[PDB]
RNA sequence: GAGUGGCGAUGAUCUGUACCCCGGCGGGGUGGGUGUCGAUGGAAGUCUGACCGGC
């Protein structure tokens, strides 16, 4: 697609709310997941405005916060918090289309694809 | 030939006998080269030609540097002052109200900078190790710019930990990202970006980012602002 | 020897000459004290090679100091007769250095990284 | 508490504020400043501090330097240190100023001019008059041609003969300096320089039989202060070829051994500092001076110089021209390294050098 | 599309290394099983984590592999794919000289020329390991790898 | 039986192919640009004329 690839180990790998919660209320080993899709160390990571969404859930449904709070995700340090997680990762994204985005939300997928270069992960 | 100065202070481009732009500064010390430069007079002031190939803020200038924080009596610490190439042009753009700190802990190229620093009161020159700050606190004083080339792989928390020392709050930091002393299997862009993290989750504001191709392989140049 | 700065293993050097080797076939090189100096000088050389039994030593004395004002890495072989004779050359070379890698370029960048290590870094 | 603060400028104690509680200001002395900077690394307080640490009697103080917290306690203190501190920031950030206010120096004009000169020798501790001498060794000579060339055509007015009869300038000018009129010439004051039998002859007759014009002591002794001038800067030429020899042979031998002392700091002049010319290809140094032939070459692809200011060189300028170009190009080789064994130290190689030189020479004459 | 981006990227590695297919599709599976059954690292030190563990890292390789470290090859899913590519004379065989410019060289490889020290190897996608014998053999003779040996300061990577 | 003399980075090639000439070479001239200076040399080659003011 006249993209130029520069991509290289480990990957970098946004993690939003949504896939979180999911894949805590369902089991699902999110980083053994990527390991396994992305076939190379990956490096996964939260925005701080996705984690802090999760805090909001967090409050009656515990259990993604943790996960989400673990060293494997580490902490995207971004300097807009407070945007929903959608906007947050989008313009987080914007300026760096080299990150990998895993999330459930199929409108947030649609208009990152638009950028080239992003690889796209999500849960059946 | 005609010279006319640009956007940024002290900062001249010439059009040629053939039609060819080049970058050059105005000469603080008049008939004196410090690498093989071409000197240039026009309408009776002499102009030092800046190879980008060169000097890597020559490079990140033509490479579109929206606001070059050096200019007309700016205090710079430069780290990695090495033989004086890319110093010896800001000492052109500070004239001889600013300051220039050369630190340099390579005697071997030390002794080249000496010269090219005897001839200019502005240039200040350090034989230590950036590592240590300590080792030069008692010479330098705080400044506006502090500018980083050096080959380390720690270079990024080297130059924060100056930048504590010495930055000024709301100076400006032009730090060069050595991806190959870095690392030489990581990708340079993974590199670019896990720097300018470091600097982001330390207090710095990314202005901007230049990547210094043609003129310097796997280098990029970040602009950003100490809070 | 003393304008040596750091210890290059065998294994390594052999990497080396392989790598100047497929960049005479492949790429560009300059071979020689004086095109290798005008090549670090012009900012075009991307890994330059130095033999460790240079006789005057002080003949490319000046390589490791013209290299980190320009930051061109810079490597050690044992025998100037062996880059040379690598080079493509009859005779001996004291220097040399490779401006396009071509075909080794990954063999350039394991090396470069190498001496990275064995150099400090991180 | 008190922050204690060591610089250039001395010692100066803050409170946590970052008010200036009590200082005691360095001497301006470049060899002490020095001495007690390198000695400050391994952890030794300097005097000045020493002094305001009695002066204010404080009993929790705090340093910049973690070497220096065992010598203060040694010395009686209870003390720690801050790395990047607000104090030790606070005093930098008016670093510009309290020179002045502890009066280090009158004014910001010359704390910097001290610095500068701190610094440049600081790092000295961590060739110049070679190259100075033979620019102003080649000021004199184009001088004494000037001057030669005026005096020939001036003094030519009262005795127009000499001037084709004298080819060598110190010799006219010797003429005119101890005679001034033609009719004051000798048989006898012309042996007392060594002027050959026959020669005498031929001046005094052609002084005899001159068709110059007859003119008054004030005409002359104008005319002869230029010939003394011309006089006194053949000695003083002589003088700085024998000074440039010794300092030329001590700071690059094999250089030297080469070229000789003039040519060889001519060239230092050129590349600017011995390490200058070290760091140099041969390619280079076969054409320094000779720039505006070499960029006219470069810009328009046209041919090149064969050879700068190399030309000199007695081996080059007097052979023939298609012998020439192997000349410079042998010889700046030989200079190269000649340069960098001078440059990175000691040995004097010069006499194997020569003799390799003399080999390439010898094979490019047999052709 | 990423899917579009992609059947760039595998066009990019398609002289990025050699090919003219899906043998990119070949090394890839390969990736996969090799990360894959390995990831399955998983686990501890089994003395089976032992046997698997010098073993599949036995994976060097000579041309092939790493350079010398791991443990965690899925460093390899990085390269491998974008490494394990190399290697074969496919790569490591125009990267010595000889060969013109990969092109012209597996046209060699195939056409009878250009031979592992001893026996030809027309398999235009071997493997290569100790390659310090990657010569032309021959046995008037192979021309274009006889002569044109340009290859004599070969040294690259 | 003792000492010397032995390709080579500590370094061969490429282009100043000048022209062509007479005997790859000797010599020759014509060439290039470049160091010197010169000559005297060559340069619309040497301003303008109605009224200027003070009153």
Same mark, same amino acid.
């Given at each position: 697609?006249?993209?130029?690839?520069?991509?290289?180990?480990?990957?970098?790998?946004?993690?939003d709310?949504?896939?979180?919660?999911?894949?805590?209320?369902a089991?699902?080993?999110?980083?053994?997941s990527?390991?396994?899709?992305?076939?190379?160390?990956?490096?996964?990571?939260?925005?701080?405005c996705?984690?802090?969404?999760?805090?909001?859930?967090?409050?009656?449904?515990?259990?993604?916060?943790?996960?989400?709070?673990?060293?494997?995700?580490?902490?995207?340090?971004?300097?807009?918090?407070?945007?929903?997680?959608?906007?947050?990762?989008?313009?987080?994204?914007?300026?760096?289309?080299?990150?990998i985005?895993?999330?459930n939300?199929?409108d947030?997928?649609?208009?990152?694809?638009?950028?080239?270069?992003?690889?796209?992960?999500?849960?059946? | 030939?005609?010279?006319?100065?640009?956007?940024?202070?002290?900062?001249?481009?010439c059009?040629?006998?053939?039609?060819?732009?080049?970058?050059?500064?105005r000469?603080?010390?008049?008939? /004196?080269?410090?690498?093989?430069?071409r000197?240039?007079?026009?309408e009776?002031?002499?102009?030092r030609?800046?190879?980008? /190939?060169?000097?890597?803020?020559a490079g990140?200038?033509?490479?579109?540097?929206? =606001?070059?924080?050096i200019?007309?009596?700016?205090?710079?610490?430069?780290?990695?002052?090495?033989?004086? =190439?890319?110093?010896?042009?800001v000492?052109?753009?500070?004239?001889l109200?600013?300051?220039?700190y050369?630190?340099? /802990?390579?005697?071997?190229?030390?002794?080249?900078?000496?010269?090219?620093?005897?001839?200019?009161?502005?240039?200040?020159?350090?034989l230590?190790?950036?590592?240590?700050?300590?080792?030069?606190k008692?010479?330098?004083?705080?400044?506006?710019?502090?500018?980083?080339?050096?080959?380390?792989?720690?270079?990024?928390?080297?130059?924060?930990?100056?930048?504590?020392? /010495?930055?000024?709050?709301?100076?400006?930091?032009?730090?060069?990202?050595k991806?190959?002393?870095?690392?030489?299997?990581?990708?340079?862009?993974?590199?670019?970006?896990?720097?300018?993290?470091?600097?982001?989750?330390?207090?710095?504001?990314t202005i901007?980012?230049?990547?210094?191709?043609?003129?310097?392989?796997?280098?990029?140049?970040?602009?950003?602002?100490?809070? | 020897?003393?304008?040596?700065?750091?210890?290059?293993?065998?294994?390594?050097?052999?990497?080396?000459?392989?790598?100047?080797?497929?960049?005479?076939?492949?790429?560009?090189?300059?071979?020689?004290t004086?095109?290798?100096?005008?090549?670090v000088?012009?900012?075009?050389?991307?890994?330059?090679?130095?033999?460790?039994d240079?006789?005057?030593?002080?003949?490319?004395?000046?390589?490791?100091?013209?290299?980190?004002?320009?930051?061109?890495?810079?490597?050690?072989?044992?025998?100037?007769?062996?880059?040379?004779?690598?080079?493509?050359?009859?005779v001996?070379?004291?220097?040399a250095?490779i401006?396009?890698?071509?075909?080794?370029?990954?063999?350039?960048?394991?090396?470069?990284?190498?001496?990275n290590?064995?150099?400090?870094?991180? | 508490?008190?922050?204690?603060?060591?610089?250039?400028?001395?010692?100066?104690?803050?409170?946590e504020?970052?008010?200036?509680?009590?200082?005691?200001?360095?001497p301006?002395?470049?060899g002490?400043?020095?001495?007690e900077?390198?000695?400050?690394? #391994?952890?030794?307080?300097?005097?000045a501090?020493?002094?305001?640490?009695?002066?204010?009697?404080?009993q929790?103080?705090?340093?910049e330097?973690?070497?220096?917290?065992?010598?203060?306690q040694?010395?009686?203190?209870?003390?720690?240190?801050?790395?990047?501190?607000?104090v030790?920031?606070?005093?930098?950030?008016?670093?510009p100023?309290?020179?002045?206010?502890?009066?280090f120096?009158?004014?910001?004009?010359?704390?910097?001019?001290?610095?500068?000169?701190?610094?440049?020798?600081?790092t000295?501790?961590?060739?110049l008059?070679?190259?100075?001498?033979?620019?102003?060794?080649?000021?004199?000579?184009?001088?004494?041609?000037?001057?030669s060339?005026?005096?020939?055509?001036?003094?030519?007015?009262?005795?127009?003969?000499?001037?084709?009869?004298?080819?060598?300038?110190?010799?006219?000018?010797?003429?005119?300096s101890?005679?001034?009129?033609?009719?004051?010439?000798?048989?006898?004051?012309?042996?007392?320089?060594?002027?050959?039998?026959?020669?005498?002859?031929?001046?005094?007759?052609?002084?005899?039989?001159?068709?110059?014009?007859?003119?008054?002591?004030?005409?002359?002794?104008?005319?002869?202060?230029?010939?003394?001038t011309?006089?006194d800067?053949?000695?003083?030429?002589?003088?700085l070829?024998?000074?440039?020899?010794?300092?030329?042979?001590?700071?690059?031998?094999?250089?030297?051994?080469?070229?000789?002392?003039?040519?060889?700091?001519?060239?230092?002049?050129?590349?600017?500092?011995?390490?200058?010319?070290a760091?140099?290809?041969?390619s280079?140094?076969?054409?320094?001076?000779a720039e505006?032939?070499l960029?006219?070459?470069?810009?328009?692809?046209?041919?090149?110089? #064969?050879?700068?200011?190399?030309?000199?060189?007695?081996?080059?300028?007097?052979?023939?021209?298609?012998?020439?170009?192997?000349?410079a190009?042998?010889?700046?080789?030989?200079?190269?390294?000649?340069?960098?064994?001078?440059?990175?130290?000691?040995?004097?190689?010069?006499?194997?050098?020569?003799?390799?030189?003399?080999?390439?020479?010898?094979?490019? #004459?047999?052709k | 599309?990423?899917?579009?981006?992609?059947?760039?990227?595998?066009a990019?590695?398609?002289?990025?290394?050699?090919?003219?297919?899906?043998?990119?599709i070949?090394?890839?599976?390969?990736?996969?099983?090799?990360?894959?059954?390995?990831?399955?690292?998983?686990?501890?030190?089994?003395?089976?984590?032992?046997?698997?563990?010098?073993?599949?890292?036995?994976?060097l390789?000579?041309?092939?592999?790493?350079?010398?470290?791991?443990?965690?090859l899925?460093?390899?899913?990085?390269?491998?794919?974008?490494?394990?590519?190399?290697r074969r004379?496919?790569?490591?065989?125009?990267k010595?000289?000889?060969?013109?410019?990969?092109?012209?060289?597996?046209?060699?490889?195939?056409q009878?020329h250009?031979?592992?020290?001893?026996?030809?190897?027309?398999?235009?996608?071997?493997?290569?390991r100790?390659?310090?014998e990657?010569?032309?053999?021959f046995?008037?003779?192979?021309?274009?790898?006889?002569?044109?040996?340009?290859?004599?300061?070969?040294?690259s990577?």
């Amino acid at each position: 697609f006249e993209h130029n690839e520069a991509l290289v180990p480990p990957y970098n790998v946004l993690v939003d709310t949504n896939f979180l919660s999911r894949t805590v209320g369902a089991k699902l080993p999110l980083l053994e997941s990527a390991m396994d899709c992305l076939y190379a160390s990956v490096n996964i990571i939260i925005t701080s405005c996705v984690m802090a969404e999760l805090e909001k859930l967090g409050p009656r449904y515990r259990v993604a916060l943790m996960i989400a709070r673990d060293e494997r995700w580490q902490r995207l340090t971004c300097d807009h918090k407070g945007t929903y997680a959608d906007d947050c990762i989008v313009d987080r994204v914007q300026k760096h289309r080299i990150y990998i985005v895993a999330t459930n939300d199929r409108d947030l997928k649609r208009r990152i694809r638009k950028i080239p270069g992003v690889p796209i992960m999500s849960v059946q | 030939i005609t010279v006319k100065q640009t956007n940024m202070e002290n900062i001249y481009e010439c059009e040629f006998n053939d039609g060819s732009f080049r970058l050059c500064t105005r000469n603080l010390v008049p008939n /004196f080269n410090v690498y093989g430069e071409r000197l240039i007079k026009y309408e009776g002031v002499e102009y030092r030609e800046w190879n980008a /190939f060169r000097s890597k803020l020559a490079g990140a200038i033509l490479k579109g540097l929206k =606001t070059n924080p050096i200019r007309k009596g700016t205090k710079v610490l430069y780290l990695g002052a090495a033989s004086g =190439t890319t110093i010896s042009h800001v000492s052109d753009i500070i004239e001889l109200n600013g300051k220039a700190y050369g630190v340099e /802990f390579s005697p071997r190229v030390v002794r080249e900078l000496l010269l090219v620093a005897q001839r200019r009161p502005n240039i200040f020159p350090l034989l230590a190790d950036a590592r240590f700050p300590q080792s030069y606190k008692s010479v330098v004083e705080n400044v506006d710019v502090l500018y980083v080339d050096i080959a380390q792989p720690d270079q990024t928390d080297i130059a924060i930990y100056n930048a504590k020392f /010495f930055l000024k709050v709301n100076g400006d930091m032009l730090l060069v990202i050595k991806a190959r002393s870095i690392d030489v299997t990581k990708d340079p862009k993974e590199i670019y970006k896990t720097e300018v993290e470091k600097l982001e989750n330390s207090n710095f504001e990314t202005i901007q980012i230049i990547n210094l191709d043609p003129y310097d392989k796997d280098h990029a140049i970040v602009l950003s602002k100490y809070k | 020897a003393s304008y040596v700065k750091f210890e290059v293993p065998q294994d390594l050097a052999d990497k080396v000459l392989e790598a100047v080797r497929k960049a005479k076939e492949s790429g560009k090189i300059k071979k020689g004290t004086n095109e290798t100096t005008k090549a670090v000088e012009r900012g075009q050389a991307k890994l330059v090679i130095i033999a460790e039994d240079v006789q005057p030593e002080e003949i490319v004395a000046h390589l490791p100091l013209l290299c980190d004002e320009k930051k061109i890495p810079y490597v050690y072989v044992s025998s100037k007769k062996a880059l040379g004779e690598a080079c493509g050359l009859q005779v001996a070379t004291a220097s040399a250095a490779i401006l396009e890698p071509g075909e080794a370029k990954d063999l350039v960048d394991e090396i470069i990284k190498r001496v990275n290590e064995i150099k400090g870094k991180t | 508490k008190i922050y204690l603060i060591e610089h250039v400028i001395g010692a100066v104690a803050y409170d946590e504020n970052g008010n200036i509680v009590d200082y005691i200001t360095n001497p301006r002395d470049l060899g002490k400043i020095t001495e007690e900077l390198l000695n400050n690394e #391994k952890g030794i307080p300097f005097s000045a501090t020493v002094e305001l640490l009695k002066k204010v009697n404080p009993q929790e103080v705090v340093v910049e330097n973690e070497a220096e917290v065992p010598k203060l306690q040694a010395l009686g203190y209870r003390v720690s240190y801050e790395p990047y501190s607000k104090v030790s920031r606070i005093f930098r950030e008016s670093l510009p100023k309290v020179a002045i206010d502890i009066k280090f120096a009158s004014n910001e004009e010359d704390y910097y001019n001290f610095l500068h000169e701190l610094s440049l020798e600081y790092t000295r501790r961590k060739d110049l008059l070679a190259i100075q001498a033979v620019r102003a060794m080649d000021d004199i000579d184009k001088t004494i041609n000037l001057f030669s060339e005026r005096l020939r055509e001036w003094y030519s007015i009262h005795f127009p003969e000499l001037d084709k009869l004298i080819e060598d300038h110190e010799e006219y000018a010797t003429i005119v300096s101890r005679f001034g009129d033609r009719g004051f010439l000798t048989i006898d004051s012309l042996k007392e320089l060594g002027f050959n039998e026959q020669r005498i002859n031929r001046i005094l007759d052609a002084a005899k039989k001159s068709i110059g014009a007859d003119i008054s002591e004030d005409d002359l002794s104008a005319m002869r202060m230029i010939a003394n001038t011309i006089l006194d800067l053949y000695n003083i030429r002589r003088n700085l070829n024998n000074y440039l020899e010794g300092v030329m042979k001590e700071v690059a031998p094999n250089v030297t051994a080469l070229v000789g002392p003039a040519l060889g700091a001519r060239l230092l002049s050129i590349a600017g500092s011995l390490d200058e010319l070290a760091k140099m290809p041969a390619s280079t140094i076969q054409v320094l001076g000779a720039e505006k032939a070499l960029f006219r070459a470069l810009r328009s692809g046209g041919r090149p110089p #064969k050879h700068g200011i190399i030309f000199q060189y007695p081996a080059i300028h007097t052979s023939p021209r298609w012998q020439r170009g192997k000349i410079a190009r042998a010889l700046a080789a030989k200079l190269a390294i000649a340069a960098r064994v001078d440059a990175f130290s000691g040995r004097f190689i010069g006499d194997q050098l020569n003799e390799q030189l003399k080999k390439r020479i010898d094979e490019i #004459k047999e052709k | 599309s990423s899917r579009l981006d992609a059947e760039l990227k595998l066009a990019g590695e398609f002289g990025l290394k050699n090919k003219k297919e899906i043998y990119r599709i070949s090394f890839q599976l390969s990736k996969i099983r090799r990360a894959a059954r390995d990831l399955l690292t998983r686990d501890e030190k089994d003395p089976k984590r032992l046997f698997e563990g010098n073993a599949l890292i036995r994976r060097l390789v000579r041309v092939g592999v790493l350079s010398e470290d791991k443990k965690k090859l899925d460093y390899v899913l990085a390269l491998k794919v974008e490494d394990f590519l190399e290697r074969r004379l496919q790569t490591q065989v125009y990267k010595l000289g000889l060969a013109k410019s990969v092109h012209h060289a597996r046209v060699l490889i195939t056409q009878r020329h250009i031979a592992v020290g001893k026996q030809i190897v027309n398999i235009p996608s071997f493997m290569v390991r100790l390659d310090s014998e990657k010569h032309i053999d021959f046995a008037r003779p192979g021309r274009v790898a006889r002569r044109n040996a340009a290859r004599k300061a070969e040294a690259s990577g």
